[PDB]
A paper describes a structure:
A recent example is neutralization of the nuclear DNA cytosine deaminase APOBEC3B by the Epstein-Barr virus (EBV) ribonucleotide reductase subunit BORF2. The seven-membered APOBEC3 family (A3A to A3D and A3F to A3H) of single-stranded DNA cytosine deaminases elicits broad antiviral activity, often resulting in lethal mutagenesis, with the archetypical example being HIV-1 hypermutation (counteracted by the HIV-1 Vif protein that targets restrictive A3s for polyubiquitination and degradation) [reviewed in (13–15)]. Here, we report a cryo-EM structure of the large RNR subunit of EBV, BORF2, in complex with the A3B catalytic domain.
However, expression of BORF2 in 293T cells with an N-terminal maltose binding protein (MBP) tag substantially improved solubility, purity, and yield. To form a BORF2-A3B complex, BORF2 and A3Bctd were purified individually with affinity resins, mixed together with excess A3Bctd, and isolated as a complex by size exclusion chromatography (SEC). Two-dimensional (2D) classes corresponding to what appeared to be dimeric forms of the complex were selected for 3D reconstruction and heterogeneous refinement yielding a 2.8-Å map. Therefore, a focused refinement around the BORF2-A3B monomer was performed after symmetry expansion that resulted in an improved reconstruction to 2.55 Å. The structure is composed of a dimer of BORF2 monomers, which are each bound to one A3Bctd protomer. The majority of this cone domain is absent in BORF2 including the ATP binding residues, and instead, the N-terminus adopts a helix that mediates formation of a noncanonical and novel dimer. This dimer is driven by a leucine-rich hydrophobic interaction involving two α helices from each monomer (i.e., a four-helix bundle) and electrostatic interactions including residues R39, D26, and E8. In particular, L1 and L7 of A3B are sequestered by multiple interactions with BORF2 including contacts with the novel short-helix insertion (SHI) and with an additional helical loop structure involving residues R484 and Y481. The net result is a high-affinity interaction that effectively blocks the A3B active site from binding to single-stranded DNA and catalyzing deamination.
Numbering used by the authors:
A (entry chain C), B (entry chain A): 6 to 194, 207 to 227, 254 to 273, 284 to 613, 649 to 730
C (entry chain D), D (entry chain B): 193 to 240, 253 to 379
Write the structure that this text describes.
Amino acid sequence: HVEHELLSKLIDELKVKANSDPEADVLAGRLLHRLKAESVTHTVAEYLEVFSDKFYDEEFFQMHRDELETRVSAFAQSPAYERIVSSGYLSALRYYDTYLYVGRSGKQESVQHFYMRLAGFCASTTCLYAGLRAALQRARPEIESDMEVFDYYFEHLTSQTVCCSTPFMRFAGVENSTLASCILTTPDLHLGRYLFQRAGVGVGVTGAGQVSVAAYMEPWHSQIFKFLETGIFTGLFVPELFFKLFRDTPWSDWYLFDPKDAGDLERLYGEEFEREYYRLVTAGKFCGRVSIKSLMFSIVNCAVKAGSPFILLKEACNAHFWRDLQGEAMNAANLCAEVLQPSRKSVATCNLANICLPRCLVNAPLAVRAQRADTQGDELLLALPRLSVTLPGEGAVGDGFSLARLRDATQCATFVVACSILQGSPTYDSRDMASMGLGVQGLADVFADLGWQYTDPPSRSLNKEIFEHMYFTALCTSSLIGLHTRKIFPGFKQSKYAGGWFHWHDWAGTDLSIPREIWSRLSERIVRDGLFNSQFIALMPTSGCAQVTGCSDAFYPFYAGRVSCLPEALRQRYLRFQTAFDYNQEDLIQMSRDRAPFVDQSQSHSLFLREEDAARASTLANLLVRSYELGLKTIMYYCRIE
Amino acid sequence: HVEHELLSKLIDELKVKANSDPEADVLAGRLLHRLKAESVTHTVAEYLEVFSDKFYDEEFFQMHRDELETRVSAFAQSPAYERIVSSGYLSALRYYDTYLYVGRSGKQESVQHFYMRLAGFCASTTCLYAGLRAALQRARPEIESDMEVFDYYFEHLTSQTVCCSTPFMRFAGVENSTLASCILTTPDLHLGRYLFQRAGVGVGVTGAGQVSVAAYMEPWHSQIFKFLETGIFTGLFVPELFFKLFRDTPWSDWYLFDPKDAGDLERLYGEEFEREYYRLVTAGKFCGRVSIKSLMFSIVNCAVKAGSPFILLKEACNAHFWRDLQGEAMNAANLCAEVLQPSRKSVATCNLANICLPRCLVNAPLAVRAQRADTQGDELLLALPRLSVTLPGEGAVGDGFSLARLRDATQCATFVVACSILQGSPTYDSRDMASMGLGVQGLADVFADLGWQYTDPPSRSLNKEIFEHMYFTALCTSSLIGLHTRKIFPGFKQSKYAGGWFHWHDWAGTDLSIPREIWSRLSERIVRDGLFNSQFIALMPTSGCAQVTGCSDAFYPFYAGRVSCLPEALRQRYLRFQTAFDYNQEDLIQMSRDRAPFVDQSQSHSLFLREEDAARASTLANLLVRSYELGLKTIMYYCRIE
Amino acid sequence: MDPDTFTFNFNNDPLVLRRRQTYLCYEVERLDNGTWVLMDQHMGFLCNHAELRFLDLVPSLQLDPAQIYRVTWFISWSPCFSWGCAGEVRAFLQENTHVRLRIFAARIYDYDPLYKEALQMLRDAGAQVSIMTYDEFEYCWDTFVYRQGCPFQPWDGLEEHSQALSGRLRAILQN
Amino acid sequence: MDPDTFTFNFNNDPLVLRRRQTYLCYEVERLDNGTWVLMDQHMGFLCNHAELRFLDLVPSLQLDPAQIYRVTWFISWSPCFSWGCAGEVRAFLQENTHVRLRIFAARIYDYDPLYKEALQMLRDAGAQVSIMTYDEFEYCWDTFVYRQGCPFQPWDGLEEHSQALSGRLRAILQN
Ligand SMILES: [Zn+2]
Ligand SMILES: [Zn+2]
């Protein structure tokens, strides 16, 4: 076999120069797919023979062998497969390194069989629960047979309108491992059984006393300084009193308390946190005497040196939860500071699925059939407007951002996350909670393809529209799933949703693209039916699933050319390719706050600073303070420095 | 440079196995394009610098350098360029061997620059004739600037909806060579000046007496037997009386005459051909006494041994011309027996352009802008129905065969042929003659993609619809061009068109997809305006463009697997891939007759026979008789034997 | 019952919910004097809806109406509703008032949307339903499983999953 | 003129129609007694619309109204209409009745859609228009071209193209 040696040598010679050649990395991906062509399964029968130990008793594949073979063969010649293969060298490398499962015989699974496995797992779960199938049929009144369920999932996954989490893409139907990517716990120091897993862990170590893991601690801790400077990340659930006292009267003195007594500061928050904090300092129970200016500058310096500390506003995180949480307050987030659940009583997980918004453009080809925008079959989504009228710019490759296929993608992602929760939760409490994080990716790609800067007013309007619409769709789909499965998350009663609430009620100056009459109908149906999921929208950095799709990293602007360091002639025409550092950080924070009311969970908001103002250690402080003033939940995830 | 050696070796290793692997020939084409990437021009400035001696005075390129660069760069990343590159190894080989021009410096022109050159030549011709521009603006009321003319031509050519002739794509603006692919002459034996050219030549040697060239001779010639058996092809303009006497009374004795006297048999045709023939035989002026059965069997045997003899019915060839031609009748065709013009008085040429009908499918992606099906601006083409309702079968990749973009392709092909005639005709008589041959390619691909056999009734209905619609569009566009250019072909007055005639009047049992009232309006506008072109539709085998576009060879079924020699299980599902030999030849002849009324010129009708009935030397005779009874012009072009 | 399948289909790990097959381990106890008495002949197990299979086998199990009996189900999945199993179990216990049913479900068959209603009507049918703890699992292993002397090997997370399922069931029944 | 320019811009091959530039070669002949007489001083040529350029050059060419003059145009392209060249020529010959114009066009400028009307109106203006044959081309070569003794070298198809253009022109004028 002399072809494979030539293929590998050409792979090296093209990937060495693939950084500056956009035509060579695509060729590298094609040649890498060709090189592994004979080492992967070619037919569904061969796939079931090689992986018989994972599929000998999987009813769906065994009884739909022929239809699966027909659809996979159609997909192989489909333009979606060509797009997937032509996604670059990194996409193919990630496929053949992580996503594509390998059996005993060494015959890896092909890309077509990989997407077959994902869609078949989803379809089998839906047909097997008999309530997810009913919910899907009510939400898609064109699906009758289980093979049509597979068709729905297969078109929505192969077209990459739904970008599933890494554990889901890796172990859906091939392993009994947990499909929840994010795990957060707050033990009374259990945790060891999750460190041996392959999912991120967020630990609240505020009560300590005197895989990737994120440790969260409140600033009033006795060893806050020892925790700041030390594999393991850092988290700061900063109280509002910190930002207040730093903003005006910076000379005021912060107080530290050891967790031996600590009053009830960890348990509660809000205005009574100020009363309890000041009662404690008047009672002389403070162990520390550190000035608040010094602590703020220490946090800023530790952030600029390394992105270790995560800054999350306790008030925004807790007061906007669907429960009261005034009595007991969470103080720990997930690994990426974008999942917000209480975790003291039991281990809380979250299942994530992203939506590549470039696939929501009208001109973007999709494997989804054309006869699916109609026959949508949900009375609350037929009445919503589409084409997202926002006047795209002159240099716009995109032609409107349909905003209706965005809702279809949100529906399919909600159903996929429901399947993942039901068939891959590590504990029954997490399974019943049904925490869903629906992030986005390619938002910068959408703005560029529509000929705008990230900051342009059309970009902000489209951002708000996207997040409001996807939150509304997630709510409606979760309500339908809960109604047709009767699996309502345990705390739905005597909660905010049960009385009429949508997480955008508790914000100031929110403009809705929905006429407020369909929100009322959604509230009525939620009240009379319930919600299957407790959390819906959570913005994941999704650095892994974006590589195989080519979508831009999450909702951030481009940060991974030298558009700024380019002549003015080739600067206005490529101004929409400005890096995230080029954009004013105030505008990014304002856009994050604009999308915040429609993100029930947190969002991995990262600040992008250059080495001219980050070293000042006063611009970052002002950014954090004004992020406080806007009520953001995750004030700072990573302090990116260029 | 080590990449080139690896590329060449892998090209060899992929093209050696490209016959049985459809994924390897595409990769071979991509890698051949990559290998020549640095050996071809990359920018429009570089293209104009390398080929300055052909474009120093070309005003269009010099004044539109920047816009051309922008459009070519957009085309490079456009999906049309990806489709062109992924057309296989043969397409790339033909590009880099024949079509792409090579300058003095050795830098070949790139594919994008090649299509730029074609579109720029067309746009420059339209701009500098000032009547083609007006006609195009009337026929496309969205084109204002010359750059929009270039956009129109570039979009239609890059998408390969319109395929120009080989001389056009080889010498459009780089050489002053003739752009007419077909040349036919009937000298009084001048011809030498065209043999030194690189175009097909068709010579009528009926008056002989006692590059590729086709010689045509009537059966009554005294040296007919010496002409039949002997680089040069063979042609037989067979009269009606031959088939009449062969069909009944085969024992009747045929007569041969020398051209020394010959009566007036060569000059005239029809019923008075029978009277002149019988008057001559009663006058005892016949040199020969050969039996008609022997002559017919000799012709059949010479055809089955080699496809040299071309059988064209003189009656259908002459009686359906737009003139009378009763007094003087043509006896010679072009190289491919598909161009029918008188050639005694002067050398007649024909400019050809093909249409890939697979590009007329609704699901086929096109480089043509979506905002072009509307704003047609031709009142006789906006009212015509589209989507060609024919109920495609279950296994249909295509979804309707729009039949409106077919008319747009016919319009653009008519304009391209007009430009070629005006700027590349070898003589003023041919330039005024304005003979246009608009063929089709990929018809078998259209039938297969619509889930039909070539013989299915939907396939026949679509065939008739396609040819009637394209003939109508050619007529309307030529009338508009003649009106806005004041260049009407010399014999339009006192001709058939000037009185109301459309070449489908003189046929029996013709069903019109046009409501016959729009035909009346076309007749009125032709009468009051005239026609720029004298001939409109002619079916070319187009064996060259089929390699570079992937469209099937002309209107023939697939003939260039072993579908017949395949198990019955994999025979019904692949039944639409039947070879042309599998289909009943009578059905093919019937479909050729069905499309004949809307083909004003002749067709390249080739019969496909196996080595079980061709050797019988009687089935071919019956096929020829049936083709005669249906009034076909070209009874047999090639007698293909498998 | 052979091993390597009792562990597979009696594991209560939610990550093992992928594969479903009901296995009803049954035994009958007679109320002699005041203490239930077990016999070796009526010990057995069933495979796959096993609930009905047992409902069809119980007429031919040498039942004596005079002496009231009690039967315990060591079923892998909780009885379901939309397939009707809870209905037939309630109907069987509605007319046959001399037989008491004990259900020990290793897992809650929440695959049925009507599982809460099924459990509620099973409770209303006079049969108490619970979730297997470690001692029921070891009793099943050393009674119905052909262990050939091998002791019972617990799986990871048995206690936690058992407690979670017991809490869910006791929340369902209290309604 | 100069070689490689007269030959390039006076070739009547339809394949050479791509390159267009009007070149006008003029000479004036006075009608002395009964025979036209040519002089060297008014011999010359123009460049690129050469027709008007000559129409504005003629008043400053020592014109004598008393003696009737005749001027011959050995123009590369036939005079055009939509740019008004034919109209300007007709206007010049309408008032200046003592000047006769002879037009010898190497090619018919059919780029103008109204070239037939231009030729017809030029004929109506009293100036006869023809197409250059071989004799006219060689006269141009040895009169208006700096040949430096090199004889005239005809191109391929001169006679055929000249005859075709002459036939077209006489068909246009007869109307
Ligand atoms: Zn059951
Ligand atoms: Zn002019």
